Amino acid sequence: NVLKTSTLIRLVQLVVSFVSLWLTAAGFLHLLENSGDPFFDFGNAQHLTYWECLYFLMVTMSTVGFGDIFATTVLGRTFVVIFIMIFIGLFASFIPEIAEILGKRQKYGGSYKKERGKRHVVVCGYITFDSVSNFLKDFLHKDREDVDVEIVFLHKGLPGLELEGLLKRHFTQVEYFWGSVMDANDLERVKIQEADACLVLANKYCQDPDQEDAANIMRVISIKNYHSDIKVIVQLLQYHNKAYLLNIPSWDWKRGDDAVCVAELKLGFIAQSCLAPGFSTLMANLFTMRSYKPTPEMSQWQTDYMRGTGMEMYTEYLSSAFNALTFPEAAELCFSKLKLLLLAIEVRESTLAINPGPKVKIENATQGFFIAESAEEVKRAFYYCKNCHANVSDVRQIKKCKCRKFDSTGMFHWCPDRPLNDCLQDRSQASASGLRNHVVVCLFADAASPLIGLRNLVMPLRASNFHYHELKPTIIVGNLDYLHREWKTLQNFPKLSILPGSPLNRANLRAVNINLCDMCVIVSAKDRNMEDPNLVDKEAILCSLNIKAMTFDDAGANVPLITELANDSNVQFLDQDDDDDPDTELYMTQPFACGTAFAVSVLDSLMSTSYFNDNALTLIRTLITGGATPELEQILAEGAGMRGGYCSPAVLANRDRCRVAQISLFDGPLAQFGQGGHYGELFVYALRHFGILCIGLYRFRDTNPSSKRYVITNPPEDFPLLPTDQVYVLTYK
Amino acid sequence: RQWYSFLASSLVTFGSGLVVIIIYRIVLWLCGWMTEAKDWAGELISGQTTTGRILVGLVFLLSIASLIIYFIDASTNTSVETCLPWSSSTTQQVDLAFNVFFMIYFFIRFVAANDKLWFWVELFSFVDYFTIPPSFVAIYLDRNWLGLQFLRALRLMSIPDILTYLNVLKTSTLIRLVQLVVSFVSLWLTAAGFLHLLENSGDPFFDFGNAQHLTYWECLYFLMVTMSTVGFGDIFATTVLGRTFVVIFIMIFIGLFASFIPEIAEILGKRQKYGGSYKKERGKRHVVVCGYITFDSVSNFLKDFLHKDREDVDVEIVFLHKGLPGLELEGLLKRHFTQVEYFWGSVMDANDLERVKIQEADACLVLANKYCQDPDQED
Ligand SMILES: [Ca+2]
Ligand SMILES: [K+]
Ligand SMILES: [K+]
Ligand SMILES: [K+]
Ligand SMILES: [K+]
Ligand SMILES: [Mg+2]
Ligand SMILES: [Mg+2]
């Protein structure tokens, strides 16, 4: 029982039958030619050796036929005619099938060899040239602090030719193995016992995100089953699927395990944009590594914008020179001397504090969160050594030492359950209601289309740090049968309403007072390849262009809008007066620079930030969710829905959360800076007088025409202000 | 006479290094700067540093130059072994410089390798053992044997890697194209060199008496003529090692030729026929036409648009569509050559809208497939 495998059985049958038939045919021809024709008295004979017959038959089998040797007896020639009819077919079918069998061996077998002190990360799930090139371009980016971490890809496929090229260019630090995290032998080959983390990537563009999330959950279950203590970072497409992996016995967020839920994050960024009109661009640029690289054809606004895109958020230890400063002194000092924007600190168990007030001191070895162009910038805060050594005034020189009811956690406003018919409205009821400064959600859904989790949109808008009178009313325009199955998650939020019908009807839009809203959100639940990539956003594009064309004579292209794109290259249709170019990537396009467009592709590089500094991912999640703690995620995972009621003063104390607001230089106390002041003067003044921490500007593109504004992240200290600018601020009140 | 003076060097060099690996493995099995060097060497040969890109280009040039020196020796030489003092010949002088470079590059490679045992068995390690040590034996004696030197042709199989390390092959069909051509050519050139060694040396068990003085170029031709299964038999092998090599060659290379020729024809058959751009005459009007373009819709459109009963106007029709036109439509586009033009492209692409100069058209006409199954999808 030595041939066990059907291809090896088939291989030995092919080779042995082919060889024995060739050897026996050669022997028969040798008998005929050396004996000669019997009816010619054996006189007609030709003294070939067996080896000449064996060669001659291979030369005719293959149809080469040199004719250096050939048969001459008449039985020899008739045997050659019979041999040609039989053996050409055998050779022509043998040679292909042996090539198929020997072509079947795996190219990327073998096992990872762990060097004496290099760290490594195992990466799996959706591995392709696109996902790998986008992953490595951020993970290995020059602006990161230099670390020897190897990336070990594990996947079932053979890599495509363009991916084999990419794996070769990174040869010294990227490795690839054929296998699956579903197999305990493959988990051993990549030494996942000894990895820092496993990263599990998702196919964001699949047809069925519940099926993709099921596959990824089974991979985490496999990795944890193999060894519980492995840090797993996973990408999830649906928020309801997070509950399943929160319930695995060995999933532990306190140890590093994490779920980058792209539906939660997507709707969180666009929800915070309804409150600060450009935040999703401000903020989504901080979480991808990019380096500012001018080109002389760029307009002023494009150079200002692109300088801002070179920023990222970094974690670093503050030097001992900061000890016993308040966070306001430490922030003035970082900004004015070090040219770094400090925005938060890890207070010692330990807790993140964003823009803490004068009550909070810098303790020894406080870790701070900075916005800066590169990790080489933030080191300056670790090396800053006061009067001892770091005395001099050009920053490049710092380099050496001192030689009503709420939810049960009080984080959100809350409402007892209701039937959807309490919040459903017809156009007359909606028009009778004086909706103004509200949020409009234009949802596009079929009744059967997947749940998008609008709770992640609405919940940030009901953050408990707002007073009830200043909560923006929200109205969803969309399919009712869809909203019935969405509603079970929404029914606990106050000031919500539904106008059932298509958002493309220009009546629903007028009834909703679309011209008076603070933000219109255009969102779709439709199948991500209902057809080819030109049709994929046609409803969202038509809805944008429809609203942009209406007339609200008691206008039209000045209704504020943010659209979520299923396919990034469709951003070109989303705006006119634009100068589109398909080779520009999304973040450089005018609709994204204006905060009018969003797409899930800008969230890809969150995976690597969860690996490099998990706390930075909790910082952004506390901002974008409006304060969703792991206790609330735990409570939601009990399946009871969001429990709430009246709250004690001790939990209600958390209503003083820091938030990102936006303020105008046109009037009030800061207006003095609008008349030709500089951003550094404004920054220091506002931090000192108000504890406001300014993080960027929102400026008109047309400095003279259109209402389009673009976002500048963290301007230089000497940057000139305009009286029409708006300032992004972290604030407590 | 001294062919073995060289086969020795080549083979013996390989064995002593292999033994030193086996005893090192066994000593360490019975009983940091290394990794910094291994990573630096890996980054260097992968073309990641600027000095890496330089070295990798030098490998591209000097692998080809080393092959050209072998063609010069294979062409202009008579006997397989040959007496000529090393101090006399400029070709063998410059060949020492290349053999030194490939010796340095071999050690670079070794430093970079993960498992030294497997490295000592890589194909390019054998190319180096059979090429360089004999090129030094040819200094110690003033004679040379053109033995396994044909293996220099295998160094061409590094070219698809160099053109990956240098990021110049970007497209998967162009990557596939260069892999096909370079592997096919180097396997043909190296096989021709091996047959030339066998026929010109003759059978060793017949005291080398059975020998046939083919040139390298006759072997190269003869192998193409048998690869393709033509087999003229104007040239053929006669030694018994020549004939056994031809039998092995027939079993391997008929499959390579029969799969290479189709796949090159698929790749070169892939270029777009109706690329290019519309050229706007000094005062002719034009109309861009797109959407459902087919022989039926175009013939019915042109029969009315260009009808003799209309007032005569010089308007050109510029069709823009994603397909290649069908044969009957190419006929119709040719009959109207002076006033109808066709471009491969889509109105969904801003570069294609520029090619048809739609800025300067009178109109764009967008035609519909009236007979589709789903008119909401067509609209
Ligand atoms: Ca940067
Ligand atoms: K033939
Ligand atoms: K033939
Ligand atoms: K023939
Ligand atoms: K012949
Ligand atoms: Mg390694
Ligand atoms: Mg013309």
Author numbering:
A (entry chain C): 214 to 561, 567 to 621, 706 to 856, 882 to 1031, 1037 to 1065
B (entry chain B): 14 to 44, 79 to 426
Authors' own words:
The large-conductance calcium- and voltage-activated K+ channel (BK) plays a fundamental role in establishing negative feedback loops to control the firing patterns of neurons, transmitter release, insulin secretion, and smooth muscle contraction. BK channels comprise four identical α subunits (Slo1)2,3 with seven transmembrane segments (TMD) and a large C-terminal cytosolic domain (CTD). A voltage sensing domain (VSD, segments S0–S4) and a pore-gate domain (segments S5–S6) reside in the membrane. Additionally, two homologous regulators of the conductance of K+ domains (RCK) in each subunit (RCK1 and RCK2) assemble as a tetrameric gating ring (4× CTD) and serve as the cytoplasmic Ca2+ sensor.
We found that R1Q decreased the activation energy of the VSD, as evidenced by a ~ 400 mV leftward shift in the Q-V curve toward negative potentials, resulting in channels with facilitated activation, without changes in voltage sensitivity or coupling between the VSD and the pore. When compared with the WT Ca2+-bound structure, R1Q displays the same conformation in the TM region (segments S1–S6, Cα RMSD < 1 Å). In the R1Q structures, R2 establishes a salt bridge with D142 (S2) at approximately 2.7 Å, while R3 interacts with D175 (3.2 Å) and F149 (3.2 Å). The S2–S3 loop moves down by approximately ~3.3 Å at position N161 and ~2.6 Å at D162. R38 in S0 establishes a salt bridge with D162 (2.8 Å) in the S2–S3 loop, and the carbonyl group of N161 forms a hydrogen bond with K85 (2.8 Å) at the S0’ segment. These interactions are consistent not only in R1Q (both apo- and in Ca2+-bound) but also in the WT Ca2+-bound state. The introduction of glutamine at position R1 leads to a more negative extracellular surface in the VSD, created by residues D120 and D142. We found minor differences between apo and Ca2+-bound conformations in the R1Q structures (Cα RMSD ~ 1.6 Å), suggesting that the active VSD drives the CTD structural rearrangement. In the R1Q (apo and Ca2+-bound), R2Q (apo and Ca2+-bound), and R3Q Ca2+-bound structures the S6 gate adopts an open conformation.
